[PDB]
């Protein structure tokens, strides 16, 4: 799966459908993996850099693969 | 769904019906989404700023959408 | 529901019947709400002040409502 | 149940039989309560002191009761 | 179980099959124990040294035993 975007988490969002949105770089992407919610919030609080991998590399795209750096 | 209130989590409360209350700004609001319990506590402990989105923007109003900043 | 006790969590205990006990102030109280187990352990680890609300305000009393501050 | 050992959680281990072993002090003990796993992992990562209670207070003995301090 | 690698967590990756990969030393290893995900992320964040134990000590090997030092 290609790199989609790399950077700090600017904000995260819990959505009404119970998915979890992240804003990294210039993209808003969401995931439906419940386990990623607390990992992504920790990344955000402590200021880690993340790399989101997905074929759906556009606003409102979904992802399931993340690299924390 | 529109912004209701933005600020630090002043306290949280586990309720008898297994919902979870947060006080943000001058409002107490609650959510029935289990996943938000641990995120909201972490946001409180680490002192994040949250934005709660809901139309029920009054004491005792419910929400399911939150932005963590 | 009236306040019973406010303070830091001195210790917590996992019991054989899969309930969870906390000692706050001079009271040991228990909850059978699984959701509170991880929330109370976090409050203990991070040094939060908790207020336990219950009508059974005596040693060995049960509760299901907590305020985290 | 009597106190068996008090100390920090030195390490943890998922066994083939779906039980969970911890080493506290000079003892490896195991539990089959799933709920206790995540509490013990949290105790382990944050360096809490635990007291394990069991009357099979020897290597390979089981427990279902824990005090977290 | 024999030691495989000891070192700092260089990065972690959440995978599409919901497993979690860590890079320690010169090895990428993964675990299917979801409870270990937040512990491994914390290790990465705080810069702890971990020892991973497995008898599959190759890139792409699986592990379930970790020691946090
Ligand atoms: Zn791929
Ligand atoms: Zn009440
Ligand atoms: Zn007993």
Domain of residue B23, CATH code = 2.40.50.70
How far is C27 from C11, CA to CA, in rounded Å?
Answer: 11
How far is A30 from B10, CA to CA, in rounded Å?
Answer: 28
User: The domain containing residue C61 runs over which residues?
Assistant: 1-69
Contact: B34, C35; criterion CB under 8 Å: yes
Contact of C11 with C29, CB cutoff 8 Å: no
How far is C68 from C58, CA to CA, in rounded Å?
Answer: 20
Closest residue in chain C to residue B37, using alpha carbons only: C39
Cα–Cα nearest to A37, from C43, B10, B38: B38
Q: How was this structure determined?
A: X-ray
Tally the domains of chain D: 1
Indicate the SS3 state at residue E32.
coil
How far is C5 from B67, CA to CA, in rounded Å?
Answer: 32
Q: Does D11 touch chain E (CB under 8 A)?
A: yes
How far is D20 from E65, CA to CA, in rounded Å?
Answer: 11
Closest Cα in chain D, distance from residue E17 (Å): 20
Q: Looking at chain C from residue 16 to 55, which residues have their Cβ under 8 Å from any Cβ of chain D?
A: 16, 18, 34, 37-38, 41-42, 44-45
Beta-carbon contacts of A6 under 8 Å, excluding residues fewer than 6 positions away, are: A24, A25, A49, A50, A51, A52
Cβ pairs A/E, distance under 8 A: 40
E14 burial level (CB within 10 Å; 0-12, 13-18, 19+): buried
How far is B23 from C32, CA to CA, in rounded Å?
Answer: 25
């Amino acid at each position: 799966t290609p790199d989609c975007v790399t950077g700090k988490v600017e904000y995260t969002k819990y959505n009404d459908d119970d998915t979890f949105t992240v804003k990294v770089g210039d993209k808003e992407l969401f995931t439906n993996r419940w386990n990623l919610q607390s990992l992504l919030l920790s990344a955000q609080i402590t200021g880690m850099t993340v790399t989101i991998k997905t074929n759906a590399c556009h606003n409102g795209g979904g992802f399931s693969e993340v690299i924390f750096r």
